[PDB]
Amino acid sequence: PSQLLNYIDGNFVTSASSFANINPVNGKLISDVFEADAKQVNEAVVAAQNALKGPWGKLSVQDRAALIHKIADGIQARFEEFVAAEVADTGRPVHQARTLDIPRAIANFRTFADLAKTSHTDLFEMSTSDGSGALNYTVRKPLGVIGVISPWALPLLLFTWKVAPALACGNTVVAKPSEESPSSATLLAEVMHDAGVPPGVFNLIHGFGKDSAGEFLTQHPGISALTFTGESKTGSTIMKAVADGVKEVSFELGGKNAAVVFADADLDAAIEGVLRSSFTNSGQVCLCSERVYVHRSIFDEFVSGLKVEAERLVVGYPDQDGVNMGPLISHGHRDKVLSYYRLAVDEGATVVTGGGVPKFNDERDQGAYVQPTIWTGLSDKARCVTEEIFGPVCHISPFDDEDEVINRVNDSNYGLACAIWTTNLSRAHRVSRQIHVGLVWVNTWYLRDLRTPFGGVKLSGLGREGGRFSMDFYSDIANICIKI
Amino acid sequence: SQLLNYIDGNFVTSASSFANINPVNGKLISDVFEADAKQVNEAVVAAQNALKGPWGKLSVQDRAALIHKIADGIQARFEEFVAAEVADTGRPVHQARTLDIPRAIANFRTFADLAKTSHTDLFEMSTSDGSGALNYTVRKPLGVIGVISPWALPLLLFTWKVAPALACGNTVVAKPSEESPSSATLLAEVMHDAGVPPGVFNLIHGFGKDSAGEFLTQHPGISALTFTGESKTGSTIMKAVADGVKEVSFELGGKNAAVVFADADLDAAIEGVLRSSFTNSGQVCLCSERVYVHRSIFDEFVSGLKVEAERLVVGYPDQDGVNMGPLISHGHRDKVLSYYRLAVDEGATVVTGGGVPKFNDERDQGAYVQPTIWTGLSDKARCVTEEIFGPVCHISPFDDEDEVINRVNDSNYGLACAIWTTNLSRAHRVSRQIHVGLVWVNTWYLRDLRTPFGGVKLSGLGREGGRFSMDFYSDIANICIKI
Amino acid sequence: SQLLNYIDGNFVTSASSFANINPVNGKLISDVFEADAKQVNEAVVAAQNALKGPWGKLSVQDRAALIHKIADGIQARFEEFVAAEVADTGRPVHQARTLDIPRAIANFRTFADLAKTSHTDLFEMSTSDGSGALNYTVRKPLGVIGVISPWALPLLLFTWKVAPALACGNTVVAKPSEESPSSATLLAEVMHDAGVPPGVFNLIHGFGKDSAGEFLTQHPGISALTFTGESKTGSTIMKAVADGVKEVSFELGGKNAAVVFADADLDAAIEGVLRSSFTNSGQVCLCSERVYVHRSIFDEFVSGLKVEAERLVVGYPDQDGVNMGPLISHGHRDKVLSYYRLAVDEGATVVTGGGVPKFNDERDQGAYVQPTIWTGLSDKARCVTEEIFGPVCHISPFDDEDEVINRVNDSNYGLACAIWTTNLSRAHRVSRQIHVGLVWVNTWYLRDLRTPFGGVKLSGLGREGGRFSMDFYSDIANICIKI
Amino acid sequence: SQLLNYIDGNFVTSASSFANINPVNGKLISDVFEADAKQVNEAVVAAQNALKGPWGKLSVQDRAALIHKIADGIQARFEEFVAAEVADTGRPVHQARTLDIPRAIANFRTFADLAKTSHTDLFEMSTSDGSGALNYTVRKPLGVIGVISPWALPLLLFTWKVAPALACGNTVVAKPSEESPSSATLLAEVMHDAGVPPGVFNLIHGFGKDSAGEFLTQHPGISALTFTGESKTGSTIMKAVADGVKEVSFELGGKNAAVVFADADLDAAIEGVLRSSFTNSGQVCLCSERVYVHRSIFDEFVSGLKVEAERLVVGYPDQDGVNMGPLISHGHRDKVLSYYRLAVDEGATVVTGGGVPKFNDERDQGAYVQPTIWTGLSDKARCVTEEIFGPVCHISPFDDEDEVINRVNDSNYGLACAIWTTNLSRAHRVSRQIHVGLVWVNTWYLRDLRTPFGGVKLSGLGREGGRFSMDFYSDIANICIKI
Numbered sequence A: 001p002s003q004l005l006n007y008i009d010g011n012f013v014t015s016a017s018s019f020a021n022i023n024p025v026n027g028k029l030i031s032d033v034f035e036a037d038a039k040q041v042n043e044a045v046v047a048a049q050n051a052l053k054g055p056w057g058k059l060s061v062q063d064r065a066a067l068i069h070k071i072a073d074g075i076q077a078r079f080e081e082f083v084a085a086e087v088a089d090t091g092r093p094v095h096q097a098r099t100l101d102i103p104r105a106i107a108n109f110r111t112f113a114d115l116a117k118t119s120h121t122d123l124f125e126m127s128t129s130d131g132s133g134a135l136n137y138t139v140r141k142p143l144g145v146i147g148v149i150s151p152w153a154l155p156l157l158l159f160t161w162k163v164a165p166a167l168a169c170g171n172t173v174v175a176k177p178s179e180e181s182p183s184s185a186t187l188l189a190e191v192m193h194d195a196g197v198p199p200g201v202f203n204l205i206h207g208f209g210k211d212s213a214g215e216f217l218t219q220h221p222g223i224s225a226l227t228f229t230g231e232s233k234t235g236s237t238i239m240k241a242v243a244d245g246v247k248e249v250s251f252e253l254g255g256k257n258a259a260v261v262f263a264d265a266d267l268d269a270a271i272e273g274v275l276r277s278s279f280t281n282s283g284q285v286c287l288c289s290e291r292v293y294v295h296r297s298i299f300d301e302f303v304s305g306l307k308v309e310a311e312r313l314v315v316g317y318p319d320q321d322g323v324n325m326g327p328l329i330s331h332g333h334r335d336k337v338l339s340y341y342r343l344a345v346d347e348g349a350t351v352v353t354g355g356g357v358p359k360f361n362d363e364r365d366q367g368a369y370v371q372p373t374i375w376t377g378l379s380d381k382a383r384c385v386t387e388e389i390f391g392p393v394c395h396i397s398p399f400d401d402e403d404e405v406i407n408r409v410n411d412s413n414y415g416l417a418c419a420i421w422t423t424n425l426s427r428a429h430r431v432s433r434q435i436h437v438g439l440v441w442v443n444t445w446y447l448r449d450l451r452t453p454f455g456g457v458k459l460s461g462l463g464r465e466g467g468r469f470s471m472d473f474y475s476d477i478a479n480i481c482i483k484i
Numbered sequence B, C, D: 001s002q003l004l005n006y007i008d009g010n011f012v013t014s015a016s017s018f019a020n021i022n023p024v025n026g027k028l029i030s031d032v033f034e035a036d037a038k039q040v041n042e043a044v045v046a047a048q049n050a051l052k053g054p055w056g057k058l059s060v061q062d063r064a065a066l067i068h069k070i071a072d073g074i075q076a077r078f079e080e081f082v083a084a085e086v087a088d089t090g091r092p093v094h095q096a097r098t099l100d101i102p103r104a105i106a107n108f109r110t111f112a113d114l115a116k117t118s119h120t121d122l123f124e125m126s127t128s129d130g131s132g133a134l135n136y137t138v139r140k141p142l143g144v145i146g147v148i149s150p151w152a153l154p155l156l157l158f159t160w161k162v163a164p165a166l167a168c169g170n171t172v173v174a175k176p177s178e179e180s181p182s183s184a185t186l187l188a189e190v191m192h193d194a195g196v197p198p199g200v201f202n203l204i205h206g207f208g209k210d211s212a213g214e215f216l217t218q219h220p221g222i223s224a225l226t227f228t229g230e231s232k233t234g235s236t237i238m239k240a241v242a243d244g245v246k247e248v249s250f251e252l253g254g255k256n257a258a259v260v261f262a263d264a265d266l267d268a269a270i271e272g273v274l275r276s277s278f279t280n281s282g283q284v285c286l287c288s289e290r291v292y293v294h295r296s297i298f299d300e301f302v303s304g305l306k307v308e309a310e311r312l313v314v315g316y317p318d319q320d321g322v323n324m325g326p327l328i329s330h331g332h333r334d335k336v337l338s339y340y341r342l343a344v345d346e347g348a349t350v351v352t353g354g355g356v357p358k359f360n361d362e363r364d365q366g367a368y369v370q371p372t373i374w375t376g377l378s379d380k381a382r383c384v385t386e387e388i389f390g391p392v393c394h395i396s397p398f399d400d401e402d403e404v405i406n407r408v409n410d411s412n413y414g415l416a417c418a419i420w421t422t423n424l425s426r427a428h429r430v431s432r433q434i435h436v437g438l439v440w441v442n443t444w445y446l447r448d449l450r451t452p453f454g455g456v457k458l459s460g461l462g463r464e465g466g467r468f469s470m471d472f473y474s475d476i477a478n479i480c481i482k483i
């Protein structure tokens, strides 16, 4: 019964085609979503381009930031509706949407609004032959129209992570959320409209990737930049697509993240930590650990403790009492994950726990659930230990030596994140620095400070966002050089 | 003269060689060994391995000291570097001697010093448990940097990339333009004699497509590709590195405007536009090929510029009084002439030049053309829109401030712009509205290595210079410690 | 109406009290309780203890949220704050409404936001053993900040100190000017109602010598003394805290010049100098009391300024079209008129003003003077060298740029300068040569809370504003870890 | 041997001289000419004038190259500087050769490089008229910097101030400790031979009160006084410059603690505390004179330290394997020995040392004392609270983490602290709660010139190092352009 419209030039509009939004909990229809055609994408980009020359473009940084705080207020005012939207689309446990996702999304807008108010640029004085000198100063200007394309994992969070700094920097936006999670972004458009954001400043287009809204956005010469979060192969495709236009790009892509547990770790803390890093969001966060290395001396105790804890996870309804894990995002994704589950056994894995789907004997059997899964026994070369699965799974392997484990962690075409567990001062700092990734946590997992640079190396992405890196990426950096 | 590749600390020949030609007289200067795919792979592998050797264990202080030794090595062979740039390119000796070589030395010393003085950030955060966490950032070497450079001011542009790559602790596989391989070869020698470890700096010669340049861009062993050249080449490379999701930096083409307002110092502006139009015979990406002059001073401006253009001395690089050398090559000369023709066919008035000079000596075998000025073309003419990269500019009157801003911005390029006015508000008000990476007011071509440099639209993506180089040529990583 | 001290979460009276008088008409506004040394001790002890309470346990986010609540509390009682400033000082209602109260609110919000967005530094270093070390800096609360503020723009200058002090997690003992105690007392109420913990913010009323002010500077329990006021007071306080080696920040007096070059927009400059000379009745430290005008435009300038000055409306703070209220007090007026006499004895020509207006109503019992303009004095005249702090300026011709730079700088003060010129080079060349902390070009009084602010010579020491406030109000500590 | 003042380009004698004595043997090294108030004035006036000279017109690049020349000049006379430091101070040759002189050289190179690489800020703002405004900051020379330095690590602490002062374009009047005049005089020769313009660097010899030191602080011609020495001297100087409101930087006394937790590497902590207690024979402000050791390892720590301390070779600066030279002077030894007796009277157990060694040669005429270890004193003992500045530490057990932090902080000093622990959380959690400017974890005395350095409480005011030096030794001015 829910209908999700595009939002283009201050108007909610339908489209010729619509597609189904399906609750992964039970397989039921949540909404019809109007798919934007290439003409509507053009309408969005053109509206965005024009909006830069309107009231939005005349706003002082201070007024622009106040307006963005008004966006945040509007989300706050409709808090539980945003909670319901994320949960409906994704099966995410209510407790997590309510305590993490929606507050972080609000925090995205408030933080980048504040960064925009407090930020400044540089002055460089130079001597010249005639001895009267010159000044060089830098300015940040809006880059122009920012195309945003985002994934279904933590959808409102990752979507606003891009939309907030884009708007804070004075840009206008055309944004295409994942076909699998279009609700909260649609709600966000409403908040934009109600908050009085000028027509064309924020445009929402629904659709898929290839031969749809996503691809049409990437091929449009009217955009100044494409920021993207998704699969590595999608990243590469988009990088080719914007190449003729030499568009500014930012890619946050896949990973195969390791957690390392050294002999001097707090073992109970590491078990809890790896449990969370492996299975949070049912293993569907780019920051999850799918490879785990544990020192040989504590390997058996670690594996036994994690098995016990994993089998205590409650897989069930998003608002079921004590639920820890919802379903995967889709039947399609479940079929891929189970295909890896089979592959693991075929590759010689011992299945410590899970390896299948739960049996509910109710509507959830029509959903997309899988069991949290632990493997041992695979060599570092097994596909299941090298390819990103994006499910609730980890393979655990022993190690003996510090340099050895660092090399095995780094032996990967991905390099997003790593978590290290140790109580030793030197070890924490020495080892972290040698890990080839964009983010290392020591003795925790999933702490995010919006001020810090974030991104990956190798196939995990290019560039960094967060803090000044967002303020620089979403801005045109220009040098004005004045001869005195 | 023979120009060898430099790979894993060894000067090596190849299966094929191509000719380096002196553009002053069309003579052979050197044969140049073209690296093949096998040799490019050897260079990339050596670079990868070098990261694990003595280079990778140097303190930032020692690394910078070694980089200062590289610069010292260039200073000590200063005139050999001058001779090499001049021979390859036809660049006036005084310019190579006073600008190019010193700037090249400056690149190394400046980025070495930036590396020593740089630092990163600390963020403290509170947590639920109430014991907090520390987040700090570190700069690490990115890995292997692939450098591909052009023929315009070759040593300068080459070392502009190589210096910060090495300063940030990277290793380098570098492919200089086929037209200008000499100074880069000399640099390899300097690096060798300075005692730079094998594999740290690798020099590979050749072309782009189906040659060393392409092979480098396709190699999965590199961590980044930094490039300066034509926009179409940039696009091609961006596609090539896309599957590996390599870090990229693109400094591409332009069609820069100069704007002279009614309140400009007219004599200063005439001199300014002269230099910006014809320096290096118009073969610098920062050159002005479009000029907008306020209608009230238009005729006087064009008159004065013509006179100054015609006083320009076009000859030998070591000739007394020389202002302009030849174009880089006969092929480039053909292209530029083809444009000289197109302009006329497009309805242009040839205010001066429009052809080639006649010397009646070896220089007629060279690739000289004349400093040229056009008027009377539409904003929509090809000669006013496409990059020519010769000693030419078109001059058009303008009337209003908002008008000229729009006309300057009406371009798929956005590299640089120069503005001439004596008015305080106008200088800042206008500069800020030009859609380019760099605006000069009342001067041309001041460059400070600390400032961010780059273009918008087809003129490129990203910035280098100062902290932008320190951040581009480094892995930026975030380490979060729960306490 | 009675104004109490606010100590350890309680409003308290004292054994002695003093009058708060409306300068518009000499009428009693309130009785103000003077803190004795015992109460100042209580305040400092309470502030030390609050550092160990819930205040000291807040995350930066929660502390900043509380500061925004303080700001919200002022916004909610906006008109009461307006009334308080106007009552105490005679300040025009229009200015209190559009500048002072909003700026005070902005002080809290800006510094709260700076606190949330601020970070510190990480330095990596190599060691012999080759394992290396990390040095990181942290900002921690400095401790108890003593704040002593003046009567010029009282809530603005008070909150300019109190806000970053609280933003950095300090606790505060603050002593506002005895001439303007109301808005600070209102602020205490806002803090109380906002639920700011007891002892975090303490308000003590009184005078300087042998009163609350001196008692604060002499107390060994404070960690810093930040001060805005007369230069001689600054010196006195610098001596007083010397045995404790307390951190200090001084914003002191000035004798600011405005310079009008021949290429200035003449109407703009007349308007600019009119405002810089007579705003707040000449009672801002940023006012111009010396004006230098190029000889070519001197007579026209002076005539234009005379006419505009004579159109200024001097009168009631809420009178329609009012430009100037009274001076702060009869004592200040006695000083200012003494300078009015002195100027004539030194040989001044009185272009306009030079006395007191005649109202034939209650304002005759207030402390009004006329806006006044002098010419004909030498640069050595006392009236041209000593700070008067009234609505007055002397105007003098100059011929040469280097000359006027030297004459502007020839002073024991160095707070601010304003320059009027439409020339691009001149603005930048000249401004850079003026020995002050702040130069404006083609405007006056623009303040951005992100920028450093302060003076040189007798005008102060140190800077506050943006990062300088974040660093002054914090302990900057270095933690160096051997890896 | 004669040590002259250096004023306005000339070495000059004075009316009276004083004796420079070798503390190794009590023998006369040099006659030092004491500058009178008249000569101090000559110095300041010359420094003021050199600001308007060639020095004032150098580009930052040229200034920096000249400072590198100074560093080169020190390098060229390397062993002469070693000899000078050793003769004045009894410092072991090996240490002067490996630490002191190379650090002094590094002070000049690092700050010259910081000068070249530094930049400032641009803030854009909106205005009611809607046209906006630019605010930019500039760093300019502050003016004449007065430098007053101590005898502990003389050349190091002297150049630590002179280098940044010069790198920021100031001129300098510098007064080294009467106990250590030689290396500073040699430095003057280096500046002269490097062709530093006259007046830029001036050297005045003499004492403090009633001598060159006091006269410098009282001269109104200086712009700042930067000081390293005793806390009481600091307070005296802060009072002296107060009427002038001179910029000040104070690096003062300390009573630093080392804390050894039970999870420390015990052998590393023993070697670390041995060095922190006895390096330079206990005569560095960064030395540990209080040590707290967890009770579980107390007896073993104390036994291990006693054994290492009794292995230290006390003797001639070039004696083989020498670890400790003499104290700086007989007067200082008398003070240290008075404390040695006081400790006994206060009830201390003398674990080792407690007197002077017997050499049976000329060293008995010197100023040697033994490395000394006490236990058994209460935290309220004078010997545990007052700075001794000798080769001594008291060692006390502790039980709790919050307890030891409180005992470390229970001091009117707050310069530095060293903590020894292998635990990640503890290192970071404990370090941030120590109320000092500098905490080392698992090392002692690592200094990086980029980091802010200073103390809290009686240990100082302000910070120098890195950007804090570039900002302290510069005028920070804000230029605001209305567009």
Ligand SMILES: NC(=O)c1ccc[n+]([C@@H]2O[C@H](COP(=O)([O-])OP(=O)(O)OC[C@H]3O[C@@H](n4cnc5c(N)ncnc54)[C@H](O)[C@@H]3O)[C@@H](O)[C@H]2O)c1
Binding pocket: B148, B149, B150, B151, B152, B157, B175, B176, B177, B178, B206, B207, B208, B209, B210, B213, B214, B217, B228, B229, B230, B231, B233, B234, B236, B237, B250, B251, B252, B253, B254, B284, B285, B387, B389, B415, B455, B459, B460
């Ligand atoms: N933005 C700047 O700062 C800047 C500076 C100087 C020159 N330029 C531009 O450079 C152009 C002129 O130089 P150019 O003629 O040498 O440019 P170019 O693109 O033709 O060649 C540049 C380099 O790339 C190589 N190359 C060519 N094809 C390649 C491929 N398919 N794969 C990999 N490498 C390949 C060449 O061998 C050469 O080394 C002009 O457009 C000029 O504006 C820009």
Ligand SMILES: NC(=O)c1ccc[n+]([C@@H]2O[C@H](COP(=O)([O-])OP(=O)(O)OC[C@H]3O[C@@H](n4cnc5c(N)ncnc54)[C@H](O)[C@@H]3O)[C@@H](O)[C@H]2O)c1
Binding pocket: D148, D149, D150, D151, D152, D157, D175, D176, D177, D178, D206, D207, D208, D209, D210, D213, D214, D215, D217, D228, D229, D230, D231, D233, D234, D236, D237, D250, D251, D252, D253, D254, D284, D285, D387, D389, D415, D455, D459, D460
């Ligand atoms: N905080 C630091 O970084 C640091 C570094 C080294 C030493 N110190 C401290 O230095 C002290 C020891 O050195 P010191 O004995 O040479 O210090 P000191 O205070 O006795 O003398 C230092 C300098 O000040 C001069 N002086 C003395 N009285 C003066 C006066 N009334 N006016 C002007 N100048 C005067 C002296 O001539 C000398 O040049 C110790 O307390 C030590 O802790 C601190």
Ligand code: NA
Binding pocket: A021, A022, A023, A024, A088, A089, A090, A180, A181
């Ligand atoms: Na869905």
Ligand code: NA
Binding pocket: B020, B021, B022, B023, B088, B089, B179, B180, B328, B329
């Ligand atoms: Na050529």
Ligand code: NA
Binding pocket: C020, C021, C022, C023, C087, C088, C089, C179, C180
């Ligand atoms: Na009053």
Ligand code: NA
Binding pocket: D020, D021, D022, D023, D087, D088, D089, D179, D180, D328
């Ligand atoms: Na001596």
